[PDB]
Design a protein around this ligand. Structure first.
Ligand SMILES: Nc1ncnc2c1ncn2[C@H]1C[C@H](O)[C@@H](CO[P@](O)(=S)OP(=O)(O)OP(=O)(O)O)O1
Ligand SMILES: [Ca+2]
Ligand SMILES: [Mg+2]
Ligand SMILES: [Mg+2]
Length: 428
DNA sequence: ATTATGACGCT
DNA sequence: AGCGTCAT
């Protein structure tokens, strides 16, 4: 009763740019706006690989991880923008720089955790307290929540009108003189996220979706419920119904092998079905940490903090060499290591100037032809100078003895991936 | 030939 | 440290 934690202590949002690389290209090229459009990497093999898709194009069945030639079969009028190529490889600088535009705006409102190039968690607990104090017990108008969905409502015929019906039910029910009502806190959080999203669109042109809830996992889940250009409030009370038909794989961290094992071992399908196991039962199958996490998570409770981190922890450069393009000679391997290192040096030097830090470790990863995993080998060495020729030489030295070829020049088995990653930053 | 990233966990 | 998982 009065002692069972309910995980309602925080207000957390997750902001996710809509089809982000596509929006970056549509801002730059107005001809692409409001069209079925996708962003592609490379071009020669099957038209290039699609890595982002506008919502107009998704309606035709275009997806990421699709060849452009195949997407054109589904959507003959599909427009394409190509990722920049520099030094023989895809170069994502435009999108990283657009990301910084958005992250810096979000940071004006609250502390953020950079989750990916186009998504950030927002810790709104303090901002909500402040806005509540300023509101002086004034009711919250629907006008302040023009793009908000309240998950689970309406309960007990435009699409927009059902949004409004649900919002009206929620607001009509809200108790406002309790400054500590979790539902009220979430609602004020949603007001702030409307403001944040309006600022992002005003100041960058970019639209986004967002989730507002009491923790990162629910905020992430919420964000995906109403896309694009909308935000969703998932209250603590909404969790039992929401989870009752929610496939386990939809919850962040459960979309892979662990989630599959939860399903197989327990013989369940939906997140809510987890509530029938004891904490010790779940720990016995999935380990102490996962078991405790699952026990709380299936009740809507998670404690992972929004980490105060706006900048990436690593700066990396990688290229696959699939099929016949696999690197089979010394000079080929060296040359591509150099290309990678030159991009790495450029990005590192900019990072040092912008962010007052220096990387101290270089991680070198490769894949050999006919190998199991993403990485066949991972080796680290010191990163003492931002110099591409040096880093490339060092990376070679580190991967030297992978070459089983007794022949001097030849490289066997051929390399299907090269990866340089700068890590272990220190203030400078 | 489902590419180029990036964070975090395990031992 | 090096490898594996999960995700964008
Ligand atoms: N698998 C993969 N490879 C390369 N680039 C990716 C990949 N996934 C995402 N991205 C890039 C391209 C995206 O514009 C960007 C954001 O990823 P996400 O959020 S999953 O998808 P978006 O393109 O923003 O559409 P969406 O969020 O509106 O569903 O990261
Ligand atoms: Ca996105
Ligand atoms: Mg996304
Ligand atoms: Mg995203």
């Amino acid at each position: 009763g009065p002692h069972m934690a309910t995980g309602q202590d925080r207000v957390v949002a997750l902001v996710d740019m809509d089809c982000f690389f596509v929006q970056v290209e549509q801002r730059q090229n107005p001809h692409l706006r409001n069209k079925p459009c996708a962003v592609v990497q490379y071009k020669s093999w099957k038209g290039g690989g699609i890595i982002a898709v506008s919502y107009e194009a998704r309606a035709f069945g275009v997806t990421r991880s699709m060849w452009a030639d195949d997407a054109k079969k589904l959507c003959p009028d599909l427009l394409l923008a190509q990722v920049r190529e520099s030094r023989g490889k895809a170069n994502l600088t435009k999108y990283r720089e657009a990301s910084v535009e958005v992250m810096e705006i979000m940071s004006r409102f609250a502390v953020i955790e950079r989750a990916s190039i186009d998504e950030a968690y927002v810790d709104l607990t303090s901002a909500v307290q402040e806005r509540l104090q300023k509101l002086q017990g004034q009711p919250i108008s629907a006008d302040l929540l023009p793009s908000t969905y309240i998950e689970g409502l309406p309960q007990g015929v435009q699409k927009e009108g059902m949004r409004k019906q649900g919002l009206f039910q929620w607001l009509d029910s809200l108790q406002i003189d309790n400054l500590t009502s979790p539902d009220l806190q979430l609602t004020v959080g949603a007001v702030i996220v409307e403001e944040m999203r309006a600022a992002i669109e005003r100041e960058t042109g970019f639209q986004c979706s967002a989730g507002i809830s009491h923790n990162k996992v629910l905020a992430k889940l919420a964000c995906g419920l109403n896309k694009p250009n909308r935000q969703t409030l998932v209250s603590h009370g909404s969790v039992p119904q929401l989870f009752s038909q929610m496939p386990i794989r939809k919850i962040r961290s459960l979309g892979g092998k662990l989630g599959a094992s939860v399903i197989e071992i327990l013989g369940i399908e939906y997140m809510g079905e987890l509530t029938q196991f004891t904490e010790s039962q779940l720990q016995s199958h999935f380990g102490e940490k996962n078991g405790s996490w699952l026990y709380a998570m299936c009740r809507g409770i998670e404690h992972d903090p929004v980490k105060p981190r706006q900048l990436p922890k690593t700066i990396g450069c990688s290229k696959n060499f699939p099929g016949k393009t696999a690197l089979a000679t010394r000079e080929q391997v060296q040359w591509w290591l150099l290309q990678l290192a030159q991009e790495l040096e450029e990005r590192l030097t900019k990072d040092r100037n912008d962010n007052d830090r220096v990387a101290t470790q270089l991680v070198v990863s490769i894949r050999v032809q006919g190998d199991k995993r993403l990485s066949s080998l991972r080796r680290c060495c010191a990163l003492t100078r931002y110099d591409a020729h040096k880093m490339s030489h060092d990376a070679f030295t580190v991967i030297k003895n992978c070459n089983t070829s007794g022949i001097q020049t030849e490289w066997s088995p051929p390399l299907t991936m090269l990866f340089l990653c700068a890590t272990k930053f220190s203030a400078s």
